[PDB]
Design a protein around this nucleic acid. Sequence first.
DNA 1: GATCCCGCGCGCCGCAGACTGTCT
RNA 2: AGACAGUCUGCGGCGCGCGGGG
Lengths: 408, 407, 932
Amino acid sequence: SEALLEICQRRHFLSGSKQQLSRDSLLSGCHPGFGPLGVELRKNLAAEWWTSVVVFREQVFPVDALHHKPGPLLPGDSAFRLVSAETLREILQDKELSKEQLVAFLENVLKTSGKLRENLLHGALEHYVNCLDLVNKRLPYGLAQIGVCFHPVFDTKQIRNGVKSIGEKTEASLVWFTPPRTSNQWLDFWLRHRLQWWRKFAMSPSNFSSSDCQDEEGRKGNKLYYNFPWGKELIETLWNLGDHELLHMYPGNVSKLHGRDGRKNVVPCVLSVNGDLDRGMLAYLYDSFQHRKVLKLHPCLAPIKVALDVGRGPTLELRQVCQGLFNELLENGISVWPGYLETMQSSLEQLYSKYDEMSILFTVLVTETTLENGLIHLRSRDTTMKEMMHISKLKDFLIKYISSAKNV
Amino acid sequence: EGSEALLEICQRRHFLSGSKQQLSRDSLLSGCHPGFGPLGVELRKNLAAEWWTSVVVFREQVFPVDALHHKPGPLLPGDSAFRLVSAETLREILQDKFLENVLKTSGKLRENLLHGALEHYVNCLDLVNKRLPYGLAQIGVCFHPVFDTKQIRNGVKSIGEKTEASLVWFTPPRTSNQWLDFWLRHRLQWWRKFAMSPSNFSSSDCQDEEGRKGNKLYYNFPWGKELIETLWNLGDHELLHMYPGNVSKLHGRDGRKNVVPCVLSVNGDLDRGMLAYLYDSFQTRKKNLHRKVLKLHPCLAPIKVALDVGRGPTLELRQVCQGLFNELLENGISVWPGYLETMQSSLEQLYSKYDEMSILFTVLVTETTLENGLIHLRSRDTTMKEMMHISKLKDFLIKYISSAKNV
Amino acid sequence: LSRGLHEQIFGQGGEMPGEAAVRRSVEHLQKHGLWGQPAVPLPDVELRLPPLYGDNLDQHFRLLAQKQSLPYLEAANLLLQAQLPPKPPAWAWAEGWTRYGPEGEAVPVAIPEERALVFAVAVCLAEGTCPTLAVAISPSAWYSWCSQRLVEERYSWTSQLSPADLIPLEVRDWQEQLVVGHNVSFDRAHIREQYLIQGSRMRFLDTMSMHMAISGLSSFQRSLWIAAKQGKHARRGPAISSWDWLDISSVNSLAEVHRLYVGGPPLEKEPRELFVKGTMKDIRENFQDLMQYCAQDVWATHEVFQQQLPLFLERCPHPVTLAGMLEMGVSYLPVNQNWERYLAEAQGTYEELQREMKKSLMDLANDACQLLSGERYKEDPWLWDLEWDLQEFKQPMDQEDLGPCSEEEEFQQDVMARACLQKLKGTTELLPKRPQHLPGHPGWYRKLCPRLDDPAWTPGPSLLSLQMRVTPKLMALTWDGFPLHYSERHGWGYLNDVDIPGCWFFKLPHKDGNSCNVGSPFAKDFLPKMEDGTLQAGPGGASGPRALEINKMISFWRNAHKRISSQMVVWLPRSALPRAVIRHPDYDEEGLYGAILPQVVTAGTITRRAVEPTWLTASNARPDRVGSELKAMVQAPPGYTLVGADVDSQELWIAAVLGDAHFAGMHGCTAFGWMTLQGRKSRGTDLHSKTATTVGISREHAKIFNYGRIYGAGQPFAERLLMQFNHRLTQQEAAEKAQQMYAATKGLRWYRWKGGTESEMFNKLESIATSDIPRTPVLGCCISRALEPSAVQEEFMTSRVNWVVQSSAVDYLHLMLVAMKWLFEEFAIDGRFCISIHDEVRYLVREEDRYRAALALQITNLLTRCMFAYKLGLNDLPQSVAFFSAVDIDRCLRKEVTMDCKTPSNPTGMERRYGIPQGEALDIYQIIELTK
DNA sequence: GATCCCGCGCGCCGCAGACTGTCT
RNA sequence: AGACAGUCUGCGGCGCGCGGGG
C-alpha cells in the first residue's frame, strides 16, 4: 500500500523509477529488478531455504537445470512462454498464425527451436536417472534447486494483440521421490516443515496460512498465501503429482526408472514443492512494516546488520578505528554498512531514521571517548535503547545476538 | 591416454558433470553440455562464494545488482545472425495480411550483464553520495550463440549457457589506468589462489579496436591456453550512449570536482574456472604410484569429510555417528552421509572412491568408539590414518579450513 | 686548447710546464701507448662565474667554509668550556618540557631557549615508534621532555606532530643552533621541525662521527679489538706483532668511547632493557631510573664531546671538513602515500612468492608418505638412507519407515562420547602423540608439520624449506647425486663417485670432493648448470626451473623487510605544507605527503664515508628482485623535483690525477691519466677492455682485474681468478708477474727498494700511507690516528693506501656540498635540502628554480676539480672532466632517467614522468634569477 | 680486493622442568 | 606400598656452510 512502496523505492530495496514498480506487476515478474538491499535480502532468504531444505535433510542433493529446453522433438502442446529460445529474438507465445510454409514446423519458430523453462520440475525429472545412482537405488530422496523462471502475462486492459510481457520469478523447487506407498505422509511432512519454515521468520506468523486442494491428476495439494494486506496471494505450492509425469518421460523400456524401498522395487512417486522467493521477500517486507517508520526484518534475514559512524572528535584517528572494526566484522562474517566515510554529518535523528528504514539491527557510533577508553555508543533498532559497549566486545555481542535470534 | 581423457572419466562417474555420453571439450567450453552434477554444482557454488567474498566483501563501495535475463523488445537495433536471411526461397508469399521478417521488434536474451549494471548506475549512484569511485558486482547466467560450423543438420544456432561473474567499476578518468592495473593484479592474485600450479594461470595485455587497453586471463589446459576472464576499459562510451539527454545526471564527485565516470568491466566465466580447477587438481617418469585423486583446494572442495562405521557392535549402534553428523553440519561443514552403504566392500576401494570425489578427510567409527572414543581419521593429501579426538573433530576441521583460507 | 684543456678563466701564467718534464712525459707515453692519438676537440663554452673571494682557489673555499661554520663553531665553543650543575634530585613527571633550575627547582618551559644542547631520546620499542622521554643539557641548566603518551588512551600509528620540539620560532640572537649527540641522527629523527620541506638553521654533530674521524678503526681492526677485549685472543693469518693501536683505538659504542676519551669509572648499563623489551607500564613504574640512565648517557656524551672537539679540530684543520660534515648531517627524503602502497605490494608479493615456493614442496612430501604402505624403501634410491619412521606412536533396514513425527531426537550422545574420551585413557589426555602413523617414509614427517602446541599444526608440512638437506632427495637428483649427506661423507659434486661430480653407488666414504678442498654444500651455484651441467632432475613441477628463481627473487626482501617497512616516516598536515605545494597541479587526492630521515652517520667507517644500511647502498631496480624498487618512491611533492648527478669515475680519476701530479705537472704524465682522459671504447686506449687483452680472457672479464689491482688486490688474487677462467693449469698461469703486473710494479726495485714505475703510479699512495706524519692529503684531513705507522707500525698497508683514495673522494664530496650551499645562499635557489650516496648527489629544488639549480652542479663540479688539481698541480685542467655528463631532473630517485622495475610491472602508470637529463642544453644561461 | 658480517637449518651438545612408568 | 630411573619437553651455548652489502 501507500507509504510502503515509497520506502522500498527509497533506500534501494526495489530498483526503479517512481510509479514504475507500483503495487501491481510486483506479484508478476514484469518489474525492474530489486535494489542492492533487495538483492541481499533475497540472497539471505535463499541461503536460509537452502540450509533448511537441502543440506540438513541428508538426502536432498543439488541439481543443475538449464534455463532453456533443447528444442528437437518439442511437443506441439505446451505453455510456450518463448517458442524461440534462440540467441536474441524471442517470438513469445506465437499462438495461432504461422499458417504459411515460412516459420512452420520446418526449422525454427514453430515449437521447433526450443522454449525457456517455466518450472524446475522437468530438469529434476531428467536428472532423476543419474541421481538414483548417486543415492545407490535408495528410493526416498530429493533434488533441490533455486533458479529463475519465465512466465507470460496477459489481461492488463486491451493492448489489441497481446504483448505477452515476460515475467521473471526466482523460485525454489524441491522434487522428492518417495515410494508410492506412504506418499501422503511425506506430503504432510513437507507441508508442515515448509509452513514452519515460513512462519519462523515472520513477526506475525498468523498471517502465514495453509489450504488444501484437489487435482484431477494429482492426488492432493497444498497452498500457502500469507494473506497480503489487500488479500491472499499464493506464495508456495505442494503437489503430489504421481508417477505418470515420470512415466511420460522415458516412455520406452521398463524397470529402469524404478528404485528399491524395503528391498522391494517400485516406480517412485514424485512430490513437487515450489516456492516463490521474490513473492516471499515482498511478503516479509510487508510483514516487518507496521509510530516511527521502521522495517523490523528478522536478524537472519536483514540485509545489513550493523552501521558504523563517527561523532565529533578529530576527523582522522577515528577513520582508522572504524576501518579496523569494519575489517574485523567482515572477517567474522557480519555485514556492516560503512557510513563512517560519510562527509555531511547531517543529523543524529535523521541518521537513525534512515538506518531504521534500512532495517539495520544496530547503530554503532565511535567518538573521541572511544579513543579515551574504548567505549562506543550502541543503539538497538528494535527497542531504540542506547547503551555504551567496549569496542572489543561488539563482535561477540553481535554473533551472540544473531545466534539467539536464529534459535526459537 | 590419460591426457584430458581419464579426467572426463571419474567426473561423470562421481557426479561432477552431467552424464550424457558427451566427453567433448568443445561442448564444455562453449556451454552446450547438459549440465553439472551435484558435486559440480557445489564446486561452482563454492567458487562463486569465494569470488563474492574476495570482490564485493572486504571491498567497500561495491554493491550487488540484479540484471534481468531479458530486455524489452522495443528500441532494439540490430538483429540475430540467422534472423538476417534474404537470399532466396520466397516461393510462398500466400500469407494474408510486430511480425514482419526483420527482427520482429521483440525481446532478446542477454549475452552479458554489463548492460544491466550500466542501467542501474544512476540508481546506485545515490547510495554512495555520488562518490564516483564505486562498483557493481553480479554473478549470473549468460546466453551465447554457438554452432559446429559443420553441415546444416544443426540448423539454427545452438544456445549455450555460461555462469559469468562481472564487476563494473566506475572510476575517475585520471585514475582509470592505475585502478585497472590494481584490479588486473587482484584478479591474477585470486586465480592463482586455490591453484596447485599457479604458473598455468597467465595474463596478457590487449588493445581494443578503438584503442582502449585491457587485459586477458588464460588457463593452460593440456591442449592449450583458454581465456577465462577479461578486463576492458570501456572509457565512458556506452554510459554516455545510453544517456544522451544531459550529462548533469552522470556527474559523480571525484575529489572535489564533478566528472563523468569511466567504466571498467571485469567479466570472468565461472564454468571455465571450475573446469580449469578440476583439471589442475588432477595430476609418468618413475612414478609407480597411480592413486588417482582430485587434489582440490580445501576452500572450494565440494565435500570436506566423509563419515563411515566399520565392524561396530551392531548396525543399531551407528547412532553415535548420528548427531556427530549433525554436529559437523553446524557451522557449515559439508559431510558426505556415508555409513549407509551397508555393503561389504574392501576399504581400499572405499578410500579410492572418496579420493576421487576430493574429500579432505575420511572418518571411520569402529566398535572401540563407544568407550575411549577414538575415530580413524585418514587424510586425502597423504594416506596416513590418525586416531585423534571425537570432541576436537569439529574444532580441528574448523581450524583446517581457516588455515587453508589464509596460507 | 693544448691537450684538450679548458679555458683558464682564473689564474695566470706563473706556473711553467718544464721542458725536461715534457720530454720525460712524452717519452713515457711513447714507451707505453701511442704519443700521437688525436681526439676530437670538445665544444668550448664560456660563462660568467660568480665573483670568487680570495686568490689561488684555496682562500675562496676557506672563506666559504668559515662563513658557513662560524655560528656552529661558536656554539660548540660555548658548550666546550661551560660547567654544569649537578643532576636534579627527582625528575619531574609532567607533559612537555621542564627546565631544572638551581637546587632542583623544576619549571615548565615551551622549548629550551638555548644556542647549544647535548640531546638524547628514548623510544618505547615495544609499542609504536613515538618518543617516550628525553634529557638535554644546556650550558646553564638541565632540561627534560616527557611525551604526551604518559596518559592512558589509544594513539595512531601515523606518528605526525608527536615527537619532541626543539627549534624556536624564527620570528633573540644567533638563530643558528647546534645539537650534539652520540648517534645524533637517531635523535634528529625525533624532532618536529626536521621534517619540514623547507630547510632550517639547525645542525647536528655526532660524537661517533668524530670518533671515526680520530681514533677510529676499520672492520678487521674492529674484529681484532673485540677479540682482544674478550677473554680469548683466519685463513692466511700472518699475525700482527703490533698491538699498540689497542690502547688508542676503540669501538663506536658510547661506553667504549667514553672509556677511551675519559678515564672515569665505566658507565653502568641497565640490564632491564625496559625500552627495548618492555611494555609502556614498566616504563611508567621505572620512570626515575630510566630518566637517570638517560641523563647519565647525556653527561657521558658531553664529556666525550669536550674531549673530542679540540682533537678533531687539530686533526681536521680545514674548515671545509666541518662545514661538509654539518651539511651532510641534514638529509631529506619525501615519500608521499605511494611509499605505504609499496610497503604493501613488496610485502604481499613476497608472501605470495613464498606460498608458490612452499606449496609445491609440501606436495613432494605428501606423495612420499605413500612409500610406507608397500614397505619398499629399497626401491627408492633417494629415501633408502632416510629415517622412514619404522617406529610409530601406537596411540539392511528393509522397511519403508519415513514420515517421522514432530518429536525431537534425544541426542545426548556427544556429551557421553566426550565424557568417555576425556575421563578414560588418562595417559593420552596429557602430552598427546600427534605423530601416530603420519611420519611415514619422509624422515620424521612429523617434524616438518608444526609441533602445534602454539601453532595448531597448519595443513601439511609447513616447516619445510629449500635448505633443510631434506629437500634434496625429495625432488630426486636435484643436489649432486642420490645422497646429499650434509654431514660427513657428503655429496662429491665439487664446485664417477670420487672427485668426479655427483655421488653414485657409494664408492668411498667421508670427504672426497678434492676439487676446491670442500664439496659439502649443495646448489648455491650462480650459474644454474641445470641445462648443460646436468646432475639436476625431478618428478616435474617446481623442479629445476621455478625453484632457485623464486629464491633469488625474494632473497633481497627476505633480510630487508625489517630495516625497510619500519623507517620512521612522518606525514605532515595540510597546514604544515608550504605555499608552493598547495595551489599547484597534482596535489589533493586525499593523499599523505611525508618524509623519512635516513638516520645516517656522517662518518661511520675509516675515512669519513657516510654509512646507512638502507639508503647508502649501491643497488638498482633490477627486474628480478622483489624489493629492487628501493631508492624509488622518493618522489618529490608537487612543485618540487630532484636535481643531481654522479661524478663519473671519481676513484679512478682521483688516482690518475694523483699519479700524474706526482710524476710531473701535466695530466697525462704516467700513461694512466691519459688513458683515463683520452681513452674511449670505440677508438682511444680505454683502460677497460683495451690495453689489457694480452692479460686475462680477452678484453672482457678484465674490469674486476684492474679494479682490484688499483684497490690493492695482489698477484695471488689474479692467479686465483685466472685459474677458474678457461680451466688453465697452475703451471700455465704465471706465478710471477709475466703477463700480470705490467701496469703495476713489475720490476720492483728495478735497480737504481721503493718505486712502482710502469703504467700506474702507486708511489704517491704508498708514500702518503707510509709517511708516519699526520697524513693530511689533498685538502688536509688527518688519518684516524689508529692506522698510523708512527708508534704503532701495524703494516696494515691494504687499508691505508685505499684510505687515501676514499678520503680524497670524501673530501671531494665535502667540497661539492660546501660549494652547493654557497651557490644556494648567494642566489635565491629554494630547496637547499640535499641527499648524498658517496659520489651520487641530489637536491630537492622547486620547479621554478629547477633549471637554475640544474645550471648549478656545473660550477660546483668545475670548482671542485680545479681545487683538486690545484693542490700539487697547475690550475689548467682537462676539458673532458670538470663538467657533469648529465644532470637528472626526474621527480623520483633512480640510477638513470629511463627506468624499469619488477614488482609493479607497470610503474609508468602511477604518475611517473621521464627525467629529461640536460647535458649541454643547460649551458645557455646565467645563474641570476633576473637572467630569464 | 678487503675480512666481515646477519638469517637460515644441522648438530651437537649441554642443563633445567615435566610426565610416565619403574624400581625396591 | 612410595622414590627413582627413563623418556619427553623447555631452554642455553658453540662448530658447519650458505646469501645481500660494505
